[PDB]
Amino acid sequence: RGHKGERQRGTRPRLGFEGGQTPFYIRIPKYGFNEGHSFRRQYKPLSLNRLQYLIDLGRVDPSQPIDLTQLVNGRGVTIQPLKRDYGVQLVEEGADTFTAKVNIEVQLASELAIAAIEKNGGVVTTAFYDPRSLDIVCKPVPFFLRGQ
Amino acid sequence: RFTPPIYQPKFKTEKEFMQ
Amino acid sequence: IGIRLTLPPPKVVDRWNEKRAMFGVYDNIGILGNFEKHPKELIRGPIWLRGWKGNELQRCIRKRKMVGSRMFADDLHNLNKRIRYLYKHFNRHGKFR
Amino acid sequence: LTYFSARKGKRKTVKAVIDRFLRLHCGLWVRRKAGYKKKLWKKTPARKKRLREFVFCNKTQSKLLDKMTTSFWKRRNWYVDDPYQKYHDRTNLKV
Amino acid sequence: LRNRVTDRYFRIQEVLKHARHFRGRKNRCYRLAVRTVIRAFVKCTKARYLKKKNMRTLWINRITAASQEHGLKYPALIGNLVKCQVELNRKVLADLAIYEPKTFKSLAALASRRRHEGFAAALGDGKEPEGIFSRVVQYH
Amino acid sequence: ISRKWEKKNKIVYPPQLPGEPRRPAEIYHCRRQIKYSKDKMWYLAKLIRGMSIDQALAQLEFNDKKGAKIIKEVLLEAQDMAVRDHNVEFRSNLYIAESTSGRGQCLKRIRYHGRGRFGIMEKVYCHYFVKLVEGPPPPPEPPKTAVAHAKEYIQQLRSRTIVHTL
Amino acid sequence: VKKGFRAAFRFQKELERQRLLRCPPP
Amino acid sequence: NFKRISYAKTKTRAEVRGGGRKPWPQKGTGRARHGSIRSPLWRGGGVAHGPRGPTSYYYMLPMKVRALGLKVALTVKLAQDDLHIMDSLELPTGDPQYLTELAHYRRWGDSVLLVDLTHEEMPQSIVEATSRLKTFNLIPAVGLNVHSMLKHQTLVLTLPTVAFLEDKLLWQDSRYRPLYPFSLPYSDFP
RNA sequence: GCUAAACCUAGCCCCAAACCCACUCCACCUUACUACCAAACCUUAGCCAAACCAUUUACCCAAAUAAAGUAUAGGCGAUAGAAAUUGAAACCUGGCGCAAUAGAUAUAGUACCGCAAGGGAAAGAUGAAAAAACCAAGCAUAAUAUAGCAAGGACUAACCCCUAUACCUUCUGCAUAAUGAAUUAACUAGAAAUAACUUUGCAAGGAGAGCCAAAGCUAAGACCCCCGAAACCAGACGA
RNA sequence: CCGAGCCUGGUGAUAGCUGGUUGUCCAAGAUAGAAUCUUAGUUCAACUUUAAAUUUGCCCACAGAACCCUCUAAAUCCCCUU
RNA sequence: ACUGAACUCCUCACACCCAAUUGGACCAAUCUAUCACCCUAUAGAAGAACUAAUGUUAGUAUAAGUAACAUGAAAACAUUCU
RNA sequence: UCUCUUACUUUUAACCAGUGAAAUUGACCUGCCCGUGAAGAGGCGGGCAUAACACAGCAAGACGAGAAGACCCUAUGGAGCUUUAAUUUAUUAAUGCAAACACCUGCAUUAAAAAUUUCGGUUGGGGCG
Ligand SMILES: [Mg+2]
Ligand SMILES: [Mg+2]
Ligand SMILES: [Mg+2]
Ligand SMILES: [Mg+2]
Ligand SMILES: [Mg+2]
Ligand SMILES: [Mg+2]
Ligand SMILES: [Mg+2]
Ligand SMILES: [Mg+2]
Ligand SMILES: [Mg+2]
Ligand SMILES: [Mg+2]
Ligand SMILES: [Mg+2]
Ligand SMILES: [Mg+2]
Ligand SMILES: [Mg+2]
Ligand SMILES: [Mg+2]
Ligand SMILES: [Mg+2]
Ligand SMILES: [Mg+2]
Ligand SMILES: [Mg+2]
Ligand SMILES: [Mg+2]
Ligand SMILES: [Mg+2]
Ligand SMILES: [Mg+2]
Ligand SMILES: [Mg+2]
Ligand SMILES: [Mg+2]
Ligand SMILES: [Mg+2]
Ligand SMILES: [Mg+2]
Ligand SMILES: [Mg+2]
Ligand SMILES: [Mg+2]
Ligand SMILES: [Mg+2]
Ligand SMILES: [Mg+2]
Ligand SMILES: [Mg+2]
Ligand SMILES: [Mg+2]
Ligand SMILES: [Mg+2]
Ligand SMILES: [Mg+2]
Ligand SMILES: [Mg+2]
Ligand SMILES: [Mg+2]
Ligand SMILES: [Mg+2]
Ligand SMILES: [Mg+2]
Ligand SMILES: [Mg+2]
Ligand SMILES: [Mg+2]
Ligand SMILES: [Mg+2]
Ligand SMILES: [Mg+2]
């Protein structure tokens, strides 16, 4: 604990206090970096690369329509209804060397990702799920046990 | 200014042989 | 001189009493029993401490929340003061800040 | 800060830090320059440009801000249209 | 008292055994004993240096005495013995003085002889033959 | 407390062989819890340490101290029991071998001082211990003569060695 | 009264040595 | 350690009865300054840093680690010739003497842990024999654990039991990460 | 060899469970323990934290968890802090609790102290039957002989010879200055996080719902003392 | 024991101040500052410790680093080789 | 010339002389699991170690057998005297 | 009172017997002179001295012992008092406006009475600076 003083007696001042000088964290002006972080919509990215991987490993079934439930059951994507995820965003990564004919339903899709799906003769659609239905669609079995 | 004296409890000085 | 001038009476321990012999049985109730029960359910003790762990302050908050209403007046007062003291200690005192 | 809450027994975030700083996921903290809104009439255009900047923080400053925020503020966020999305990850960084 | 020391007697006794021969309350009271025992042990460690030093001054004193019997000074004896290529340490020379006085006289004679050879060489500047005892055995 | 001095008279030695000097009789006796300082008692105990029984009794009879009569009583009891129980031939043929005072169990009282303040007073008790041995009192050690000193000094000189040598 | 065995045992051994030193066997 | 609840508690200086007032003035007397008779320094005071309340020692190893533990224990039992397999735990007689002397002849060891598949369908003979005995212990397959296996010298498994163990333990490998607790229904699990 | 030392069990602690108490007769709100005559409901404050202080500064309220230390609040400082929503498994007679300076203050709210409210102790140890060895300090056995931190090197030899400025703590640095200690026994002082590191498990996934993840995740190990004011406020008790 | 009684509680009040902080052994280890109702304290830097990653570190030789004031030295910085 | 260190050499050995701080190797006793069975082993735990707080309680010293304290006289113990 | 003190009695005293505290105490086998340690030494250096033990005196030293002081300074430590310090008017009194048909209630204003809190830093110290 060293020699006798404020530190050694265990009464050392709070984190961020600079011994009287206007503290660094206070000195800086406020800016709305995190103004409405909670009310912002978030979308988990699913690369075409990842989607291809899941099809190849048989985690998802391209013979049937691919949905949020199918992706989650394949464990290709993890969706947190809390923490304000609004679903899955299809992203252009792995557009090349994507060779699969799929009927996929995502919440957001980039132009290039749509193009990649359609080239192989697949069908992509864009759907909206509200927080409640998103919870229900991602974990159907717990919802069924709720009784409602 | 002044401090009052303190007395010991009486039992300490009132002890006797055990018979 | 604080040492005993005779040997203490020898300790006999039955290593094969029922409690010791059957110790640890059903610890794997979940993994071997289709996860119908968690091993934490096998814990027998205070209501507030069943399958939960926490420091002194956390334990006190938990006790107050869960069995606080059923507590004796003097015991409740002591718990209140304990929380109040531990709050001040953990928040305002220490080496690392 | 509050290391242990009376209600929950959890570490608390200092809300001052959230109001002033942005955390990039890579570990960097972004801030505005102090006095960037102040007395612009008496300041040179070069100085005004220097003030209108988003600047990174020291290692020591970053460590301070990390301790003053909970783990929630350090999570990876996939915001729909994030202007700072590209800045979340570091590229070609050696030690 | 969930845990308390049961072996304190023996811990005390370890220090106290070294204090037995002290006088006063130091010998029996631990608080006082420990302090004196630390001093005793420190002194004991530092005394090794002095032992060696004191032995050598004792030897020199004895050698001086024995040399003075033969009318030779201590520096004279040691110096000239070295010049005669004899390497006898001070311990052995002191022993010889006490136990082998005839041998010591021989050594005193040798030192004295070499001393006179030195003086003759110093006086006889230039080209002169080396003293018989002055000449040195060469090792290669 | 301990009461070992009492148990000392309970020792039985095996019968002596015909070709053996006669063992002098030893008697152990003590008085416990005498209301008297052990320090004061010590002087009287020291006084009679080498003396015969009759000499000791005489000295104690004409002493002015309180403890003197107590030691006299203990000595008389010891002399009586020596002859009666311990098979001592003559009551006169005894001498004090050991004469000691020890501390007794004591009581704390309060001593009032001349303010609110006070002191702790201690009621002193002591034990007197005596060992009597049958036979004439052993002669006192003679003072060292000049010849004895001389002899000792020569012995010292003759004892000395050449130190720190071969 | 302190719980434990080791200390008591050690002390018994010490007392045994003391008894032997005080009264040596023939 | 996971089941452990320590019930040791000591009174703090607060909790000890009395000790409200200052024993004497600070400056007046020649005595050392004290402000309570119940401080740790005092006889009959509160303890400074003693055990506080019922304390819990609860923690969970990952499920995979615990299953690996079981596999490792079974492996070690087989490697060191301490594992025996039985068609059934059927005895001709319920006499515990029979079971002991059998084990002695087979050179099993001091202690034998016998495992049957299920509790309900346990044979009456082995139940009767084992109930009296101390070192011989009868558990269902669900009751199997590392501590018991290590405590007992010999492990005895039934053929139903061995099949059961393989299924349950091998399921831990080649399983997905859980979406929700396995107690809740899955397509293929129960 | 005195004083002493030693002991194991009265009891207690935390839980669990279970919803407790309540007339022999007589007396007892007047000066209680004395047979017998003309009126209650009503914001707590303050210490403390903010390194001052003045707004402000967690304190049960209907039962775990998670949402979440999030939304919010706030000299927008110190700090305070939700909810919607999710979801809860039930075997009392146990103890890696204490064992007479411990564990209750308790052998007892007694003795004692105080006008009062109020404060508040200490301690016991035989054996089946009592109708049966040694060890703290202090001493004693046994006072003392040039000279000196009490010893060390030694020595034939205790001393004589030579060498050696007690311990702790404090002050910007210094001890030899100042602080603390008669001595013995017992008691008496480092509590936890984020983040890192080390060791396992599994691995683009980890975790026995929630959470994290551009090799990470899970688990474990491993860091944060003791005593002391003058004060302030609330409710009693005192001429 | 009245410049504001006493008792109990809040209360383990607070104390940047004083005092104390208990086994063994080894190792590395000392004096640029800035801000502060601040100089009996704290925060940042400097120094110190550990672990890890990677390449240079120190010592340095030629060359090189101002005029003005009318003077001004020991020196310093930079620096291949070694 | 000689004397003169913990410097250097010599025979053997080697982690074995800094405050705060920091890193590491061991470890007394106790409880628990399993051993062991004249007092131990591997682990897991923790009210886990006191030459010092004018520390708390108890014992006993020092000052110190000190300061201090106490009963008018004779007698038959009737009594009388001061 | 003093020059200038003396004699006697009592108390105390000292000795004998009984009873028997307190402050104090690191350990002490506890000398002198000179020097050193910014002064200051029983203990350090150079000299000198020195069989060992009581009892009675003494007060030069042991920065002699116990508290209680006085002085200066410090604390973002207290408290009492004062005000033309800051923040208030919850209280009281009065007034006005609403309500109600003088009192009460709400709002506002004015005073009294208090309440809470503080009294930065440098400059011998104090005044003027
Ligand atoms: Mg310091
Ligand atoms: Mg200091
Ligand atoms: Mg009086
Ligand atoms: Mg209290
Ligand atoms: Mg005192
Ligand atoms: Mg006090
Ligand atoms: Mg206090
Ligand atoms: Mg207690
Ligand atoms: Mg404050
Ligand atoms: Mg008790
Ligand atoms: Mg008590
Ligand atoms: Mg003794
Ligand atoms: Mg000397
Ligand atoms: Mg002192
Ligand atoms: Mg009246
Ligand atoms: Mg009156
Ligand atoms: Mg404090
Ligand atoms: Mg080193
Ligand atoms: Mg300022
Ligand atoms: Mg200041
Ligand atoms: Mg300060
Ligand atoms: Mg270079
Ligand atoms: Mg030399
Ligand atoms: Mg050497
Ligand atoms: Mg060297
Ligand atoms: Mg070496
Ligand atoms: Mg402890
Ligand atoms: Mg001790
Ligand atoms: Mg102490
Ligand atoms: Mg005297
Ligand atoms: Mg007198
Ligand atoms: Mg006198
Ligand atoms: Mg007298
Ligand atoms: Mg005293
Ligand atoms: Mg002097
Ligand atoms: Mg001197
Ligand atoms: Mg005298
Ligand atoms: Mg002195
Ligand atoms: Mg103040
Ligand atoms: Mg204040």
Tab-separated table of N, CA and C (backbone and C1' of nucleotides) in Angstrom, chain A residues 2 4-9 11-14 17-22, chain J residues 14-21 34-38 41-44:
chain	number	residue	atom	x	y	z
A	2	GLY	N	2.176	1.076	0.203
A	2	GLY	CA	3.123	2.178	0.197
A	2	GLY	C	3.088	2.978	1.496
A	4	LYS	N	2.233	6.238	4.080
A	4	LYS	CA	0.977	6.773	4.583
A	4	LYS	C	0.535	7.958	3.728
A	5	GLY	N	-0.752	7.943	3.364
A	5	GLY	CA	-1.387	8.943	2.519
A	5	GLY	C	-2.835	8.555	2.232
A	6	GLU	N	-3.477	9.278	1.306
A	6	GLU	CA	-4.877	9.048	0.979
A	6	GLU	C	-5.073	7.645	0.407
A	7	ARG	N	-4.124	7.201	-0.428
A	7	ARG	CA	-4.185	5.908	-1.094
A	7	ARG	C	-4.071	4.780	-0.070
A	8	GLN	N	-3.143	4.943	0.884
A	8	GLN	CA	-2.745	3.913	1.833
A	8	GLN	C	-3.839	3.705	2.880
A	9	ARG	N	-4.586	4.776	3.170
A	9	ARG	CA	-5.696	4.740	4.107
A	9	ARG	C	-6.944	4.165	3.437
A	11	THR	N	-8.783	5.696	0.922
A	11	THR	CA	-9.791	6.723	0.705
A	11	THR	C	-9.480	7.519	-0.563
A	12	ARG	N	-8.859	6.847	-1.541
A	12	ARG	CA	-8.442	7.431	-2.809
A	12	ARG	C	-9.678	7.835	-3.619
A	13	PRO	N	-9.718	9.071	-4.187
A	13	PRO	CA	-10.914	9.599	-4.856
A	13	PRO	C	-11.346	8.838	-6.109
A	14	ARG	N	-12.601	9.082	-6.516
A	14	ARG	CA	-13.332	8.353	-7.546
A	14	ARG	C	-12.588	8.355	-8.880
A	17	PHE	N	-11.657	11.491	-11.454
A	17	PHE	CA	-11.311	12.698	-10.716
A	17	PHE	C	-9.812	12.962	-10.852
A	18	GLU	N	-9.460	14.219	-11.155
A	18	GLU	CA	-8.100	14.598	-11.511
A	18	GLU	C	-7.475	15.476	-10.423
A	19	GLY	N	-7.973	15.337	-9.189
A	19	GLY	CA	-7.412	16.020	-8.035
A	19	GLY	C	-7.754	17.508	-7.987
A	20	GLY	N	-8.803	17.914	-8.713
A	20	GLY	CA	-9.307	19.277	-8.628
A	20	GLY	C	-9.445	19.954	-9.989
A	21	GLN	N	-8.478	19.692	-10.879
A	21	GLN	CA	-8.525	20.096	-12.278
A	21	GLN	C	-9.804	19.546	-12.905
A	22	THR	N	-10.430	20.344	-13.782
A	22	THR	CA	-11.613	19.921	-14.519
A	22	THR	C	-11.298	18.616	-15.252
J	14	U	P	-17.893	6.157	8.135
J	14	U	O5'	-17.097	7.515	7.888
J	14	U	C5'	-17.574	8.471	6.926
J	14	U	C4'	-16.895	9.806	7.110
J	14	U	C3'	-15.381	9.782	7.239
J	14	U	O3'	-14.734	9.648	5.980
J	14	U	C1'	-16.281	11.190	8.904
J	15	A	P	-13.407	8.758	5.847
J	15	A	O5'	-12.307	9.647	6.581
J	15	A	C5'	-12.000	10.966	6.101
J	15	A	C4'	-11.204	11.739	7.122
J	15	A	C3'	-9.865	11.135	7.522
J	15	A	O3'	-8.910	11.566	6.564
J	15	A	C1'	-11.004	11.995	9.430
J	16	G	P	-8.336	10.562	5.456
J	16	G	O5'	-6.947	11.264	5.038
J	16	G	C5'	-6.284	10.876	3.817
J	16	G	C4'	-5.474	12.034	3.275
J	16	G	C3'	-5.044	13.130	4.266
J	16	G	O3'	-3.694	13.533	4.065
J	16	G	C1'	-6.093	14.091	2.383
J	17	C	P	-2.529	12.980	4.999
J	17	C	O5'	-3.039	13.327	6.469
J	17	C	C5'	-2.697	14.577	7.097
J	17	C	C4'	-2.871	14.496	8.596
J	17	C	C3'	-2.164	13.349	9.302
J	17	C	O3'	-0.774	13.576	9.521
J	17	C	C1'	-4.388	13.495	10.085
J	18	U	P	0.257	12.342	9.478
J	18	U	O5'	0.040	11.639	10.892
J	18	U	C5'	0.519	12.252	12.105
J	18	U	C4'	0.099	11.458	13.320
J	18	U	C3'	0.552	10.011	13.389
J	18	U	O3'	1.929	9.861	13.729
J	18	U	C1'	-1.697	10.173	14.104
J	19	G	P	2.782	8.634	13.128
J	19	G	O5'	2.177	7.328	13.866
J	19	G	C5'	2.334	7.200	15.303
J	19	G	C4'	1.444	6.099	15.827
J	19	G	C3'	1.613	4.717	15.196
J	19	G	O3'	2.787	4.049	15.628
J	19	G	C1'	-0.677	5.196	15.428
J	20	G	P	3.604	3.156	14.593
J	20	G	O5'	2.675	1.864	14.390
J	20	G	C5'	2.552	0.938	15.492
J	20	G	C4'	1.357	0.048	15.271
J	20	G	C3'	1.478	-1.005	14.169
J	20	G	O3'	2.251	-2.138	14.538
J	20	G	C1'	-0.615	0.042	14.015
J	21	U	P	3.142	-2.867	13.438
J	21	U	O5'	2.062	-3.434	12.409
J	21	U	C5'	1.293	-4.629	12.676
J	21	U	C4'	0.363	-4.930	11.519
J	21	U	C3'	1.029	-5.357	10.219
J	21	U	O3'	1.317	-6.742	10.133
J	21	U	C1'	-0.597	-3.712	9.754
J	34	A	P	6.471	22.384	-13.272
J	34	A	O5'	5.111	21.931	-13.965
J	34	A	C5'	4.832	22.276	-15.334
J	34	A	C4'	3.513	21.689	-15.766
J	34	A	C3'	2.303	22.084	-14.930
J	34	A	O3'	1.813	23.357	-15.323
J	34	A	C1'	2.272	19.754	-15.309
J	35	A	P	1.264	24.375	-14.221
J	35	A	O5'	-0.161	23.764	-13.857
J	35	A	C5'	-1.222	23.761	-14.826
J	35	A	C4'	-2.348	22.878	-14.360
J	35	A	C3'	-2.964	23.248	-13.013
J	35	A	O3'	-3.862	24.361	-13.079
J	35	A	C1'	-2.572	20.909	-13.105
J	36	U	P	-3.912	25.419	-11.865
J	36	U	O5'	-4.630	24.596	-10.706
J	36	U	C5'	-6.002	24.178	-10.828
J	36	U	C4'	-6.327	23.115	-9.807
J	36	U	C3'	-6.224	23.539	-8.350
J	36	U	O3'	-7.408	24.197	-7.918
J	36	U	C1'	-5.138	21.456	-8.650
J	37	C	P	-7.320	25.617	-7.180
J	37	C	O5'	-6.980	25.222	-5.675
J	37	C	C5'	-7.755	24.228	-4.971
J	37	C	C4'	-7.989	24.650	-3.541
J	37	C	C3'	-8.961	23.771	-2.760
J	37	C	O3'	-8.208	22.922	-1.899
J	37	C	C1'	-9.649	26.063	-2.685
J	38	U	P	-7.666	21.499	-2.405
J	38	U	O5'	-6.217	21.837	-2.970
J	38	U	C5'	-5.475	20.850	-3.714
J	38	U	C4'	-4.057	21.312	-3.935
J	38	U	C3'	-3.343	21.836	-2.700
J	38	U	O3'	-2.762	20.764	-1.966
J	38	U	C1'	-3.021	23.325	-4.530
J	41	G	P	1.475	14.586	1.280
J	41	G	O5'	0.064	14.298	0.569
J	41	G	C5'	-0.885	13.435	1.240
J	41	G	C4'	-2.239	13.593	0.598
J	41	G	C3'	-2.386	13.049	-0.826
J	41	G	O3'	-2.680	11.659	-0.825
J	41	G	C1'	-3.276	15.223	-0.726
J	42	U	P	-2.063	10.705	-1.944
J	42	U	O5'	-2.873	11.107	-3.256
J	42	U	C5'	-4.169	10.542	-3.537
J	42	U	C4'	-4.919	11.379	-4.546
J	42	U	C3'	-4.565	11.128	-6.001
J	42	U	O3'	-5.292	10.010	-6.491
J	42	U	C1'	-4.690	13.465	-5.599
J	43	U	P	-4.639	9.057	-7.588
J	43	U	O5'	-4.754	9.916	-8.924
J	43	U	C5'	-5.941	9.876	-9.737
J	43	U	C4'	-5.811	10.820	-10.907
J	43	U	C3'	-4.712	10.500	-11.906
J	43	U	O3'	-5.086	9.490	-12.833
J	43	U	C1'	-4.648	12.802	-11.389
J	44	C	P	-3.967	8.540	-13.472
J	44	C	O5'	-3.199	9.510	-14.474
J	44	C	C5'	-3.808	9.926	-15.708
J	44	C	C4'	-2.953	10.961	-16.397
J	44	C	C3'	-1.543	10.533	-16.775
J	44	C	O3'	-1.482	9.778	-17.980
J	44	C	C1'	-1.463	12.664	-15.767
